[PDB]
């Protein structure tokens, strides 16, 4: 269930509401201000890291579950999504349908969205690929 959630369900949740569109209108207080702006943020593919921890000083290192148990940490990994920004504009005149066009400013660029706690011995966890000798080396019970 956890591997299904990580591998497929996260991307589906992202793709359900990937688009976020903010519309600025003409603001026709003057005839020189006849431009309407369409501001769109789209979420792309989502990336997950290996389990990990940042410390107080900002140093970030791989977190193994034994240390997480010892240091009262949370055995979690980061989530990164691809965010592209679409900005559109249209000359707003009354009596005509608005036709927005890309201003060719599409900046894109993974952004960190949060830390997903990782179930142990899942496909993202370190212990899934570990052998018995590796588990002994990591002080984990086979």
């Amino acid at each position: 269930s956890f591997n299904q959630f990580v591998d497929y369900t996260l991307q589906d949740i992202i793709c359900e509401d990937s688009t976020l569109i903010l519309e600025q209108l003409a603001q026709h207080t003057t005839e020189s201000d006849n431009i309407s702006r369409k501001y769109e943020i789209s979420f792309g593919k989502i990336y997950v890291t290996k389990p990990m921890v940042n410390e107080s000083d900002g140093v970030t290192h791989a977190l193994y579950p034994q240390e997480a148990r010892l240091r009262n940490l949370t055995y979690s990994s980061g989530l990164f999504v691809d965010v592209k920004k679409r900005t559109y504009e249209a000359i707003d005149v009354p009596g005509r349908e608005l036709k927005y066009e890309l201003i060719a400013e599409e900046s894109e660029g993974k952004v960190f969205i949060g830390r997903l706690p990782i179930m142990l011995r899942s496909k993202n966890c370190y212990l899934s690929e570990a052998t018995e000798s590796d588990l002994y080396k990591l002080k984990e019970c086979p």
């Binding site: 569109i21 903010l22 519309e23 600025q24 209108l25 603001q27 026709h28 369409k38």
Partner: peptide
């Protein structure tokens, strides 16, 4: 009198 920004579903 205009509402300025708005949500676009």
């Amino acid at each position: 009198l205009r509402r300025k920004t708005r949500q676009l579903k």
